[PDB]
Ligand binder design. Structure first.
Ligand code: HEM
Length: 108
């Protein structure tokens, strides 16, 4: 870890305002622009069923952990050139820590 637990409540509202437009986090939630994130931690990328991922993200084969995730959020196209994820990134560590604390709980 190089990822410090933040505030899950602060994390939830980041999600709502920066990620809800393309993703759901609930168990049984649907895929939208972006795939559903239920159970993404400890799972490699491009593996949710019934979702058309890029070749890019598939091949990348990232194993998603709090630390991988933090780098990805920093800058998504920079981390996985080729990705269709349209997000510029979360530059502040504090914001990323919060959001990951939230994702950690919500996708379990
Ligand atoms: C900071 C908020 C966000 C979070 C936590 C998030 C998280 C992620 C993660 C973890 C993946 C990879 C999924 C996998 O490997 O199963 C992903 C992929 C994706 N996200 Fe997001 N994302 C966010 C913002 C957005 C937004 C706002 C959009 C839509 C404008 C978006 C669109 C996508 C797309 C299209 C992909 C598929 C990538 C590809 O196939 O190349 N994401 N997202």
């Amino acid at each position: 870890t190089e990822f410090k637990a933040g505030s899950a409540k602060k994390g939830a509202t980041l999600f709502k305002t920066r990620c809800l437009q393309c993703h759901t986090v609930e168990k049984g939630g649907p895929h939208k622009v972006g795939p559903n994130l239920h159970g993404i931690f400890g799972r490699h990328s491009g593996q949710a069923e019934g979702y058309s991922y890029t070749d890019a993200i598939i091949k990348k084969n990232v194993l998603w952990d709090e630390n991988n995730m933090s780098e990805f959020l920093t800058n998504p196209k920079k981390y996985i050139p080729g990705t269709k994820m349209a997000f510029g990134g979360l530059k502040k560590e504090k914001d990323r820590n919060d959001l990951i604390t939230y994702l950690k709980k919500a996708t379990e």
